[PDB]
């Protein structure tokens, strides 16, 4: 029974591999060769945000591209005014072992989580001025690697138990559990339309999920090591995935395949965090190399490098208006580059 | 206008920085210990604050969550076939890129030759502290196991981190953790000042 079924699975995998081959027409590495390169884009740190006492695992910009939240293992979420460097909030955590965070696009809530297997959502906007946890979205059976808000009442989380889940924040429950994967789920990126999201995992694969159903629409493979980070290309048809194999890979959802690898012979460091510029032309990826490369998303040229950190770069993201790149690191600083 | 908004934000910043500076004296003062073999345990020995993390809520896989324990003073590693698993875990931690600066306090609790044939040729290496009346075959086994862990610990790290094996009374065990942490901290400082 099992052998017949596993053989069927292999046949289906091969039919899919061939279906992908069937679409393996000229790709970006052949198509964009006649497109002027982005050149060498230098960025300088414009702002240094000091105050974390511990490594910073995650950040998320709100939609105003001014309020930035970052999470660190000193037990705090710090909401920074990225233009002035002033702290707005320094929110205590129930537990310091925090791996992720998210900022509601609205600025009303901030989320975080880690080894508690709880996504903790705070009310940033409250009459007392005291930021408190509104909900403890308990129920994961492993650590929270990543969370992202869809709305004030909806959050998608990724965890160490190999699943992702869409939570109803007010009722405090998973409404959709997105099962699949074999290893830990490491990263979420919501598509701009919040109908789709993509989830990276330690299976060296990423899945495109329909957030409205517990269904995987597409599985993307091509990685050889754990995926640590995903970001969508800003039109929702593609995403970049960072992994331990030091190759960031661009995938396209309609093509159902890898389009491009962003790698270099001199990089043997993994990718810990990825993001795109508003145009989708620049792909940024943070590494164990204590820097962030700014890849030409269409050509895979390396262009410039952001290298203000001494320790692992993680916690990378870009503002909604495309104005700035913020990176965190295990050195406990955020740096805003442009 | 916006000048009042800026004033207010600066005042808020000051309130926050002052609170973080207070918190900083607790954060740096309280030592973190990771326990292998999240449930936070807080304790104090001779007025030194420590807290230990029994990370028993994360399933079998360790690749990504042990990685978050990079600032830990020490990993408390508890042992007792199952030994090879403990040695392999110890080794992967020991050689982990992010845990390569963290010392390990090792607690060895509780036929060896069928799992470790080399044990048969093992001689208790002179320095031993058997209990009076303790069976020499047990003494031999305990030091053998201890040494296999040390063989791993002395293989790499270039002095960045050390293994502190102990055998196993919670009072004595916690006393050992304190003393091992004391040695861990002094060794870190001695290397910072290039005195070790």
């Amino acid at each position: 029974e099992l052998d017949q079924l596993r053989q069927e699975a292999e046949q289906l995998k091969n039919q899919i591999r061939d279906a992908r081959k069937a679409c393996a027409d000229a790709t970006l590495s052949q198509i964009t060769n006649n497109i002027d390169p982005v050149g060498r884009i230098q960025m300088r740190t414009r702002r240094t945000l000091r105050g974390h006492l511990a490594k910073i695992y995650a950040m998320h910009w709100g939609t105003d591209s001014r309020l930035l939240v970052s999470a660190s293992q000193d037990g705090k979420l710090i909401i920074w005014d990225s233009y002035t460097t002033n702290k707005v909030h320094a929110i205590p955590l129930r537990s310091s072992w925090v791996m992720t965070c998210a900022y509601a696009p609205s600025g009303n809530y901030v989320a975080c989580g880690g080894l508690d297997n709880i996504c903790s959502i705070y009310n940033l906007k409250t009459r007392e001025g005291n930021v408190r946890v509104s909900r403890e979205l308990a129920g994961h059976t492993g650590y929270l690697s990543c969370c992202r808000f869809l709305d004030d009442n909806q959050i998608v989380t990724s965890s160490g138990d190999t699943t992702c889940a869409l939570w109803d924040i007010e009722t405090g429950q998973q409404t959709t559990t997105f099962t699949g994967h074999t290893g830990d789920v490491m990263s979420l990126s919501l598509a701009p339309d919040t109908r789709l999201f993509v989830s990276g995992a330690c299976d060296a694969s990423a899945k495109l999920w329909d957030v409205r159903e517990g269904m995987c629409r597409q599985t993307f493979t091509g990685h050889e090591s754990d995926i640590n980070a995903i970001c969508f290309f800003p039109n929702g048809n593609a995403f970049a995935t960072g992994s331990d194999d030091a190759t960031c890979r661009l995938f396209d959802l309609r093509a159902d395949q890898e389009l491009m690898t962003y790698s270099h012979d001199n990089i043997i460091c993994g990718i810990t965090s990825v993001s795109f510029s508003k145009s989708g032309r620049l792909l940024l990826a943070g590494y164990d190399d204590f820097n962030c490369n700014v890849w030409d998303a269409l050509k895979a040229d390396r262009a410039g490098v952001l290298a203000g950190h001494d320790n692992r770069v993680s916690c990378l993201g870009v503002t909604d208006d495309g104005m700035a790149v913020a990176t965190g690191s295990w050195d406990s600083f955020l740096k805003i580059w442009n | 206008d916006q000048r009042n908004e800026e004033k207010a934000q600066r005042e808020a910043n000051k309130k926050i920085e002052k609170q973080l500076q207070k918190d900083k004296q607790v954060y740096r003062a309280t030592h973190r210990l990771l326990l292998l073999g999240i449930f936070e345990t807080k304790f104090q020995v001779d007025k030194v604050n420590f807290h230990m993390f029994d990370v028993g809520g994360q399933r079998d896989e360790r690749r990504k969550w042990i990685q978050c324990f990079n600032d830990v003073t020490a990993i408390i590693f508890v042992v007792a076939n199952r030994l090879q698993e403990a040695l392999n875990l110890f080794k992967s931690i020991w050689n982990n890129r992010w845990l390569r600066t963290i010392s390990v306090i090792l607690f060895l609790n509780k036929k060896i030759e069928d799992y470790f044939p080399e044990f048969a040729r093992y001689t208790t290496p002179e320095d031993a502290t058997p209990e009076p009346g303790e069976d020499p075959r047990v003494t031999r086994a305990k030091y053998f196991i201890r040494d296999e862990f040390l063989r791993i610990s002395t293989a790499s790290g270039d002095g960045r981190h050390y293994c502190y094996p102990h055998f196993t009374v919670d009072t004595e065990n916690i006393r050992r953790v304190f003393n091992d942490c004391r040695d861990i901290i002094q060794r870190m400082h001695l290397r910072q000042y290039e005195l070790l």
Partner: nanobody
Amino acid sequence: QVQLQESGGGLVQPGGSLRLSCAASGFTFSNYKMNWVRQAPGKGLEWVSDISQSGASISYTGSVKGRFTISRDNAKNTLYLQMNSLKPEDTAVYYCARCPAPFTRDCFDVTSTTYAYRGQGTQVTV
């Protein structure tokens, strides 16, 4: 996609030998440390052996030292486990497993029950 396929299992008369191979694909085999994992029936997953990226250092479970040996041919993306003088005690499913990251020394979660970078394995009986 990462793929590891073991072959060469079967029933081997006690005291005999068996050559178990693992065909690897997808990943750049030459950048990874590789292991073998064993599941005796009724047991969890035991680590059996560890061969370095370059095929240099090799480590073994003490229980198999001198009885099982390993090698890798990077040019063929193939890992091998040569089992000599097999005992009934060695009945197990043998699995090919890769160490998570390229260019490393650590092998976390090899022998984890859900480790992703592992093959289906072959049943070896004695």
